[PDB]
Amino acid sequence: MKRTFQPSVLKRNRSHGFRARMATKNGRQVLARRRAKGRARLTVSK
Amino acid sequence: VKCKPTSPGRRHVVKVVNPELHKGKPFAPLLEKNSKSGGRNNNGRITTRHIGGGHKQAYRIVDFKRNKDGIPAVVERLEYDPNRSANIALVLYKDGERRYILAPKGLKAGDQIQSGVDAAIKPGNTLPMRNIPVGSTVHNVEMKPGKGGQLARSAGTYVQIVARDGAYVTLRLRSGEMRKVEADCRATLGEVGNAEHMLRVLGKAGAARWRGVRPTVRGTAMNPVDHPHGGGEGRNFGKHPVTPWGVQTKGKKTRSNKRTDKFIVRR
RNA sequence: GCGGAUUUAGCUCAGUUGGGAGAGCGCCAGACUGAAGAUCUGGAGGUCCUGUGUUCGAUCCACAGAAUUCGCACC
RNA sequence: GAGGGCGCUUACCACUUUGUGAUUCAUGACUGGGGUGAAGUCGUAACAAGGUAACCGUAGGGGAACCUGCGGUUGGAUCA
RNA sequence: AGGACCGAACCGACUAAUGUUGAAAAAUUAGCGGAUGACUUGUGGCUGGGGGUGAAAGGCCAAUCAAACCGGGAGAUAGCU
RNA sequence: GCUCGCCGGAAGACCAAGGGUUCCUGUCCAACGUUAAUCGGGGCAGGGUGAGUCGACCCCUAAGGCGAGGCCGAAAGGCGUAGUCGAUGGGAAACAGGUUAAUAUUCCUGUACUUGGUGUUACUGCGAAGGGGGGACGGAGAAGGCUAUGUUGGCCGGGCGACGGUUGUCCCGGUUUAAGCGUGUAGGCUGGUUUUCCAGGCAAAUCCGGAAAAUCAAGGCUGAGGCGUGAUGACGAGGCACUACGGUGCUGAAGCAACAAAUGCCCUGCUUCCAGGAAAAGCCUCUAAGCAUCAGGUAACAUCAAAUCGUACCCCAAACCGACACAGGUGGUCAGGUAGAGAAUACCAAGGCGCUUGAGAGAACUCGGGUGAAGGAACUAGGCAAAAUGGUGCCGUAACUUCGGGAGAAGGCACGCUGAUAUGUAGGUGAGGUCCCUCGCGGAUGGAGCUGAAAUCAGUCGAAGAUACCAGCUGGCUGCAACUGUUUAUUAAAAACACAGCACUGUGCAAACACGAAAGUGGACGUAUACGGUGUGACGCCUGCCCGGUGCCGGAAGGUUAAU
RNA sequence: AAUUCCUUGUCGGGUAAGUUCCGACCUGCACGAAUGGCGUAAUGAUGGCCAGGCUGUCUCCACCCGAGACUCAGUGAAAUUGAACUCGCUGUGAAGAUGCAGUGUACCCGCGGCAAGACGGAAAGACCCCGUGAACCUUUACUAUAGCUUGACACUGAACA
RNA sequence: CUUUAAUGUUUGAUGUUCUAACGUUGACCCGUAAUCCGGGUUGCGGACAGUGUCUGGUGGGUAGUUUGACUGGGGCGGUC
RNA sequence: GCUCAACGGAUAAAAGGUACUCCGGGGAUAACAGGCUGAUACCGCCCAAGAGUUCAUAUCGACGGCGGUGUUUGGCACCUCGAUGUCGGCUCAUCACAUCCUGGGGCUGAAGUAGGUCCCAAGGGUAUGGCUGUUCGCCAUUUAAAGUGGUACGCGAGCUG
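The joint structure predicted for all components is written out below.
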């Protein structure tokens, strides 16, 4: 009902957790594609 | 309810005639030695014990073992316990300590509390049955001889010492009177403390089954996603057992350790 | 309409290689009763639905027909 | 200048009824009680052992015809 | 004393009426309760696929999930205009 | 200027979802405010939000992460004890002013404090990983104070106040008294103080549990604030001025007693009830060892360190979200005001700021309603829509016993507004004045200065006075879920039924269930009167009977005829 | 009662009128003991008409401040598509005349009435099947896998009666 | 040489048990101011447990099929 | 060698109300209707027995009969299963008629009274409360009036169910 998009830092850890996305092999491949091989940046690291 | 003090329900003036009306058995604070019982079922993961609602367990009485035998003692109070309906009491032992004991109906005066090998036959902590006479009342029974109280409560389950039965293999009790366990187990005497809280309905509801849990309420009726029945239209009408496990008679046990039951006349 | 039971003792009904007609019951006699039933022992009680054919022999079966009667067809 | 006439004030108080009950008559829209017993038809336990009884509070099978087991105080034959 | 009888924003879900060519996969106005708790109330961390908690739903659970919002199987089956 | 709005449980407050620097202003029109456009957090030139105390570090813990050694594991992985994370539990711990555009427990300027070093004098024997006190909770409450804050006027600055009036009985303006030091009062807790000993307390104890003698009673531990202390400390009526027209530059009053009431303080007081409100720790002491002509800590005063942050705009809610300044949602925070049972409602004082569509017109277009001649629902699926009646109290009210309850049943009704009793009654109040006492947060006598019903005997103006907003139709029945209901948001809004007893039933107990591969965690800190089947249909009676069939199973006399 | 076979089943008592305001001779196929039964507490997030309440509720709304929309200024997007210059029963059937013509001859515009006319939109009709077919629940019919459950070899010995 | 005994000599198996299997989710002792866990005495019952196949049905607790066609549209009755 | 008796056998075999509803095509698919025109029906009557009182020819109707406006029902049929959406309360009023009277003749089983149906033809009324889904069937008081085929059995760009 409370629909939807909003920002927070503490909900991140089990899903959008940046170092958790390096710890899982699931995440790791995608990160490297998205900015190591694929020309690009992320930088939203605060 | 025919004992005294019986404490009767009110006149029909409100929705709650019962529950229990007993004065003189709630006190505070929850005194230094205590603990609680934890969260909801959380068994890890897909929970098997139905309907739940599991808040507020809550606090329990921390005294088991109770092996403090021949150090004599005396009685400050008696209380309640809502986990067991019980007549539990405050026993000051004359070495230098306070306990919480499973006492009978009116065991106060402040009385003469003392137990053990040969030393007493009186109102008595935890008492070896090999040392003492025959009687109807027994209570504690260390469930196998060093473990602890088979009955944590005085709710009317009279377990009864027989005399010279089978070399010390006494007790004459509820669902199988040839239970045959050694008189090296410990009694206390005896099994009637709070009849009143269990000889009558407390409520439809009362606090004991809604402020902190849910009981059973359904299994067969509604939604076929569970039990073996039954189409809809309010009809059901079929052959529907408690699958895979059975119900209104069959038995379940073959083998196990101890397994001392010997005759078990059933019905 | 097709398939089926059925028209076998007052009463309920059994029965068929395909050649006897049955029983509980009911009546009647024999006596026991002044009398009758029971219970008794003996006798008796038939539109075997009709026609036709098979056939040694049809109550039966097959075929044709009456007439009750049952289910389904019908929406 | 004093009332009575009146002209004010409000009752006692007749209507009225919020109410609903009393009882008295017939319209007695599933029928059950106590009997004459115009031949009713199924029974048939007890007034002698009403021919392997049961009366007295009565619980109970359920054609009750109360069967049917106690406890008597003998209006139930005896030498049981 | 009491899941009182009659009470506030913290509850929902009765039929309309200006809700349908939307302010809204939902909420409404002069109206109206359950009056303390068979209430709901919000920071997070256990339930992460054919789910898992039961006022016990075929409703849920992204808002329309008898299984999707997955994209990898796969530009499948294909009596298909 | 001048006349009134809206939010009225304000978009009042500072600051927490990390969104992040887009307030004052100096300047403006696309990169957009579907009129203007001067304003919108628009968006551009400056700069900024000054925290030792605010709070998350800590020492730390109930949930739950990770975890030695492991029991196991196909590679995966799972479940863990010691540990260690960890607040939203808890301990130390900011105010009177003044000060800038701002931004403000910070800036200052004063009070003077908290943790822990060192210094000089003094008092003095300590310690710890262990023990003990309790460190510690749940709401509705009850009893009495303190006034927050108000209206008065003595008194103090104005003076008699533009229309008709006003020149001592009126009518306006502040009504402030900082701190930490100082003692103790409301109810409260608790008779005092030496000694001698254990069936006690991880090994010990000048501490705590229980027990044994001596000798006196008036002993011990604070609590709002009243009251003061400070203060020739300030703030400020009002005067003479300069000016950047913001403001500060000089100068400066007045300064008491009561009256009624919290939301709030005291009150981890004190009562009343049970669903029975989580540990370490600050609080305060005991000792083990080992130091023991050495060391330790508690005191006066002098000082030092005071550990990366963030602090800008912003909320019962437009840079969150909804994505059209959205009839979604939805807060922890000062509690603004009289008359109100009240977060039942039209009025208010601010702060934001009246929120960028209104000129005019006046067919029929039902987003509505009214008072109707006649009749009184003569309408239909919805007396549907429009209501109306809706206190305190009575001139008094019917079926009906679960003698609670059916009973604001039911009914129509004096009510505006003064007099007199009474230049205010009665009822709450207790200034002085006068006394007594223990000597100080002490009592007794006494009637000040305020408040204010309820009715009596009189008055009468109407179409109207509960002259206004809050707010009810008696019934009488048809089926007795008998427990209020908010229950399956989504057909029914219950005409679903979640109750709750119980005969039988699962297990004599490593108990039934096994989610997970290994747990043994629910049930258990627990016994077949705990806990689970399949349900139960207030309460109390009542559950006849009837075993042909098919269930339920349980058995063993003996045949069908498998591993073996 | 969701049995009321017939026929609006009844006595007619009451009623401007009994398809009942209930005012107790039954025509009871396939009724009731926990899928139970004789009954009822005060309470309505009250299901159903029938009163006397007020009455416009019919037939009767012919008078309104007025919202506005047509109307005058800012601004003008699509749920998506049959070209108009579309005849008011028209007739005639690859069975439906706004386009096979027997008639009548309707000037160009209000998008202002906008009443039957894209049979239309909101969109794989719901009725629905060629369906070699998505899995979608059950039942003394099929069962199957996990499970229930005893006895039997596996495995863990014989000394003695 | 057998119906069969006595006993030797081949040899087995149900009861009846005792008990270095075993299970210790029972206690004392113990590493250990310790919830897992180390381990020895004891105390218990008992060749029990355990599961892996074969036999037996038990029920609609995962998964599955939607199986002809004939149709004056289907259910029936009749056919290649 | 077999109820492989679904015998040209794609298989050893496990069942359903399209009362969840769908995938790409949606009458190459069977709801009632839109009506080609209907055999069963309305509408027009034939010649005649009969029994109308006691004469057929008014009433009325024997076994006998010829044919059409499509509303029964049904040979059903299409461009119509990506609106072909159903009642029948009216409502918008309209239709000319199987009379329904209000009526003026022609006729009399008319002497009048009253009955009898039938051409010339469709002016107003189509209203009633207690009843139920009521077409049908009434029930009290009824009048200038108290009637009736469906036309897609009058109605979703106009009614809640």
